[PDB]
Design a binder for this molecule. Structure first.
Ligand SMILES: NC(=O)C1=CN([C@@H]2O[C@H](COP(=O)(O)OP(=O)(O)OC[C@H]3O[C@@H](n4cnc5c(N)ncnc54)[C@H](O)[C@@H]3O)[C@@H](O)[C@H]2O)C=CC1
Ligand SMILES: NC(=O)C1=CN([C@@H]2O[C@H](COP(=O)(O)OP(=O)(O)OC[C@H]3O[C@@H](n4cnc5c(N)ncnc54)[C@H](O)[C@@H]3O)[C@@H](O)[C@H]2O)C=CC1
Ligand SMILES: NC(=O)C1=CN([C@@H]2O[C@H](COP(=O)(O)OP(=O)(O)OC[C@H]3O[C@@H](n4cnc5c(N)ncnc54)[C@H](O)[C@@H]3O)[C@@H](O)[C@H]2O)C=CC1
Lengths: 525, 516, 516
């Protein structure tokens, strides 16, 4: 077991609790007509409290448990927890969590006697739950057990599936809520495990409040059946179409709850799952692009004080885009055309073949560069043009299966009429890329539930009381395509900035300042 | 555009900015039990920035008549005189796209809504504009810069014609040509050399006299143009490496004596670097040869003059310093990185020779070493700690200056999976490199106006590692390992500019949004 | 499936097919005035096809324990015994996909509607099935074929396990290992050699005795398995070239004497080819070394035994023999063709050495020479008659047998335009090569049953150029230039099979549709 111990008077320990002092500095800016930027530095001191006692087991409930990602997630936990080595044509392989930033990345803690960097595991600075301690269950409109799910997904090595057969065969998804109009029509045949059935045993959208109550109870039941104290819910089911947001329906917490009781057509299954989780005080993460978090739902989360986050896992093509586009603009290069094509042959692609479902994904993938473009008016302005042509395409091509093929072209302008053209072919084994990110989201969300803080009054010791994070956990942005935000705030999509935020947060909790890369030990005499 | 920070850390006195800064870091030790003991450190400083920048900055390029050299002069003239030009896409206005100092922005803070407010990179503190560069230099070929532009085939025909009158006036000074240091196929190109014998033939004898002539050229350039500040940058053919031998080029004293002795380990770049250091003018190496031997670093340390470089990081390697870092930071394990390149300009022609290619193979290959050493979860004895990496550069005349980079990043994912990223990158080499040369010059000049003291003012340690963002193989201070990640390199520069104006490091914590 | 043509050109007599054929061609001369004078020629023949094919065909592979050798045996066993196997995509049935003789079709004519009717390539005339191959061979490494499969990492794990019992029974015969002909890194792999001295150390002395042993191995293989027909194919490490010297390997007589003299220009492949020719068994070279020196071609001509080869044309080069031809046939002018490759199998490991790589550089580079020489409108002194072409092969262990080919075809269009085709081709080398080895064996056996006479029957000229479709650098008859275009190579085979059954050449005129 690796650990970190910082010698600092900013941190004090007491009864499994870590209390850390931190001075947060930032600055407010105004721009004069003359083109002058007036910068006024701001400061706010805090005391962060971290409950060091992490749960021995963490309950995980996945909506879409029997899908490619859901089944692969369960397989990865079982394989790593029980060290299930498996056979491949390249020999015996040992399970690992590669692709997971929380489990397989490192962070610089400082320098050695020679002035060179010393790194430690991301999850070694402070106590975090291990995916090996995840107790997983969930719902799926299809009743196939998880062994059948692995067979169906065609994601994992045959021998590994066989070694996991006995255990996975026993994991069966709980019945779920299936409202036909929210996902592709071609999914009809797949639905045979539903709770919303009428007297004649037929799927119905009537009684949405009852469906909501069933989900809340499902959570309570799962918790007690596993003698668990903490649970997190994550949506990893078919991408739904967007719902319309209209006054009097889902614009406020009050209207939202009433609309559910009224079986309103703007209430999707994800809307119900999110509402149920929020009401149970269980963090809810949206791994898909539909606009689940309508204003009325955000309001509900704010009122209940329950964490919510998400909107589409940022796993491959978009993850790279949030790195490349940022790099080009940061370098003073001007992207003017970004074409992104994708073809895959799994059920995700099958569902996305329907225009309404595709639309949701089109928006999340296209929006990732908006803030980057708006950050540079030297390159993007009225005189030179402030637009970047951007197209997103997703086609269902059964033969490639889960190995989604992303083909992109980044065409940029250089000085004096020149250009730079970067063409990419990226083979994305979607579930293997996504599963570790789902793991990261769960690990980081749990960590955040143990953090509280209070503003410090410079002239009054121990003033105010501890509070939890604002409900929308933007700290999870690294893993999501279209970061949900607090009203009024714009999202920041740059991958490196998103990781830096997490890095500096873990650092401040153990008494360390932000990474500055100034390296004065080397640059100054 | 300007920036004014309300802070008591900064005080202005006689066109001089004095800024207080507390530098924090931490020293780490790891125990056998796997425990990291971190001890924070702190050191207060007072930085002084001479706000009086030169109205005109002298630039002397070695390899002035080459693709990059001629494009540099054209870019300065085109932008300075607003030379719009015709293209099949219509009339275009000149700009400095591709330049990080001229065309990128930095976040200064947030607005009343809590959202980011950005300002130009060169607006936080006064920096010299490339429009005010006065350029001269050397080249073993005497073609004037208009003829050089024609030869390079880099710029739009109409732009070349509109710049003809002005570019025809610029002619490279003769240089030092030691045949064995560059490709043999460059012989017919050399017709502008100072190192000639009684019969008028190129000679490697009299290297000290060659050094004195370069010093004279620098002195004359300053006097002719009434310039007080000059910077020299090597943008000439990539040279083969020289051997570092005890008693030859290991010390400042031995180095100078070796030059006087016409030692075979003294390359033309060695002489240009020595001459620049002796004239007190910063010297930047835009090529991969190991110009900065120990004796030269010593000389720079002794004279207190800036040196930096070793290969412009412009295209394939720049992207690699971003992608490889991204993958490892994400917990993904690259295991194979194949990088191929073909180009048809003189750079490629020179690089077609083994000894010259070798220099470039090293700079492009080393960019990921630090990244791989930073993660022992992925890279260790049990799982393997190596990343197969190959660098290939082939001369293919038809593509000209538009170098084609083809790469494949093959990485391991969990449970036996893989990720394969294949790339085809068309790099208009000179248009990518020119703005970087500009950045290096602008940033170097800025650094010469910075001094500091712990709390007598002193200048930066001679090796300007702050310029790493623009170089493939960052030269480092003895004992120190280079850091190649592009984003970290830009972050270093960003936080430096920020602290000079009293702002702390960017932290991205955004507590205004994340906390109640 | 079978084919029966109603024709008076064919007559059957004692399991023998006799076919009349009038071969037309034309001789051309060009005048200074630019006039092409064409004189048609005609020669009637009577071809005889022995319809009695062997029930079992002996196959002896040099390099039997390698990636291709072990995959070949696995493919034969899997298909012969219908060994279905599990994969993450479900149960799959074995097949010979990638084999032109087993899985491609040929147009026999049109139906009543005037539309094409196709039949299997191997259904026009009786050909041996790979299912009836009896395989043995040699390898400098003694691992049995199951262990060889494990080592190669080519086949699905479950298939390997289902074939374990049968593959474990196959073990390569010891071979001839002359260290200087292949990469030095192959030393530790050699533990199965016949050429050992008194101390039991590998030796290059006694080459004639090595030759006699190979002949014995062939004779024994035939006797042990009661086989009357055997074919030998080289699928071992690529060797470096040998020098062709007068008095050494220029003639049949000098060649044999050089072997007896243990001459340094006698490679292991030279000995295997000589031994095969002397035993009257066809010999196919699946590698690029220049095995067929003049003296060996002479020997084959004298003995009247078939020889062919020089590098399997399986992936990057196969596609090139299609794309380069397509562009030039279209009036488009390729000016730059860059071809890069990286792989991590033993083939790549061996090719990492310069001398071995050189052999492959030549075979892959020559495939476009004839194409470029065929069009003097595009390629001439005024416009330039060269196409820059580079071939690169790098060893990158992580990709294993899945070789990655990255190419760029840059061509000129009218009025200064260009076309740029960039490709990333993942080549599972053994799965691409194995069916080609099968095709070469099937087609070679077929050719041994063909004789003809102008109108005593004679066999084909020793060098079987009809096999060019499967080889990169077609060996040719003295004075004759090779033709590398894939489509023309398949057309040659197609029309040969057609004429044997009384059908004329495919003409694609389709007058049934084009004319009233
Ligand atoms: N795999 C990746 O790399 C990425 C995936 N995503 C999203 O994650 C989601 C899951 O992807 P996959 O596992 O590949 O898809 P999938 O189609 O294999 O699995 C989704 C599962 O959800 C179940 N389902 C559908 N509606 C449901 C409901 N109302 N309640 C309960 N179960 C329901 C389906 O029966 C299916 O088993 C999709 O929305 C996809 O767009 C987002 C970004 C990246
Ligand atoms: N363009 C790019 O993107 C990058 C270029 N570089 C390097 O920058 C250098 C310049 O590149 P290009 O302008 O394309 O090449 P180039 O060959 O067109 O120009 C170099 C010039 O140097 C001159 N020269 C050679 N030896 C000399 C000497 N001893 N003294 C004075 N002049 C001399 C040559 O006559 C030529 O005009 C090369 O070493 C190249 O490898 C490094 C990284 C990237
Ligand atoms: N796989 C492909 O797509 C193509 C392969 N080739 C050539 O086919 C050959 C075989 O390829 P692989 O099976 O992949 O290589 P490999 O290295 O796996 O197999 C070659 C085998 O030859 C054996 N060997 C070496 N020298 C020998 C000797 N003197 N006598 C007997 N055995 C000897 C080695 O021990 C090894 O098992 C190579 O020369 C390769 O360049 C040519 C064109 C395409």
């Amino acid at each position: 077991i690796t650990s970190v111990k910082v010698v600092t008077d900013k941190c004090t320990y007491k009864d499994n609790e870590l209390l850390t002092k931190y001075s947060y500095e930032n600055a407010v800016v105004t721009k004069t007509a003359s083109g002058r930027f007036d910068v006024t530095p701001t400061v706010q001191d805090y005391v962060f409290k971290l409950d060091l006692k992490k749960p021995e087991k963490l309950g995980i409930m996945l909506i879409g448990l029997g899908g490619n990602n859901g089944s692969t997630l369960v397989a990865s936990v079982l394989a790593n927890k029980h060290n299930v080595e498996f056979q491949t044509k390249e020999g015996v392989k040992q399970p690992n969590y590669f692709g997971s930033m929380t489990q397989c990345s490192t962070l610089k803690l400082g320098i050695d006697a020679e002035g060179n960097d010393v790194y430690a595991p991301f999850n070694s600075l402070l106590p975090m739950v291990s995916p090996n301690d995840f107790v997983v269950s969930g719902w799926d409109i299809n009743n196939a057990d998880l062994y059948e799910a692995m067979q169906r997904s065609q994601v994992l090595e045959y021998d590994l599936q066989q070694r996991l057969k006995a255990k996975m065969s026993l994991v069966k998804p709980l019945p779920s809520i299936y409202y036909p109009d929210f996902i592709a029509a071609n999914q009809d045949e797949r639905a045979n495990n539903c709770i919303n059935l009428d007297e004649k045993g037929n799927v119905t959208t009537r009684g949405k409040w009852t469906h909501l109550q069933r989900i809340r109870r499902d959570i309570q039941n799962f918790k007690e059946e596993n003698a668990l104290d903490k649970v997190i819910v994550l949506w990893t089911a078919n991408t739904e179409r967007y719902v319309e947001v209209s006054p009097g329906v889902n614009d406020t917490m009050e209207n939202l709850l009433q609309s559910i009781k009224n079986d309103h057509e703007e209430i999707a299954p994800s809307t119900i799952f999110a509402a149920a989780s929020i009401l149970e005080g269980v963090p809810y993460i949206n791994g898909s692009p539909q606009n689940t978090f309508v204003p009325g739902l955000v309001q509900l989360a704010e009122h209940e004080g329950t964490f919510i986050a998400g909107d589409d896992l940022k796993s491959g093509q978009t993850k790279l885009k949030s790195v490349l586009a940022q790099f080009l603009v940061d370098a003073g290069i001007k992207p003017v055309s970004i074409a992104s094509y994708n073809h895959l042959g799994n059920n995700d692609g099958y569902n996305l073949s329907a225009p309404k479902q595709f639309r949701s994904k089109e928006i999340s993938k296209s929006s990732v560069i908006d803030d980057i473009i708006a950050s540079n008016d030297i390159l993007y302005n009225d005189k030179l043009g402030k637009k970047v042509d951007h197209c997103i395409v997703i086609k269902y091509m059964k033969p490639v299966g889960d190995s989604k093929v992303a083909m992109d072209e980044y065409y940029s302008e250089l000085m004096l009429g020149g250009h730079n053209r970067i063409s990419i072919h990226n083979v994305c084994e979607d579930s293997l890329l996504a599963t570790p990110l789902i793991i990261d989201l769960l690990v980081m969300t749990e960590f955040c539930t143990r953090v509280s803080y209070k503003k410090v009054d410079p002239v009054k010791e121990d003033a105010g009381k501890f509070e939890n994070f604002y409900p929308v956990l933007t700290f999870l942005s690294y893993w999501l395509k279209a970061p949900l935000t607090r009203p009024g705030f714009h999202p920041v999509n740059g991958l490196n900035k998103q990781r830096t935020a997490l890095e500096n947060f873990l650092r401040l909790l153990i008494g360390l300042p932000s990474q500055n890369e100034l390296r004065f030990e080397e640059r100054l005499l």
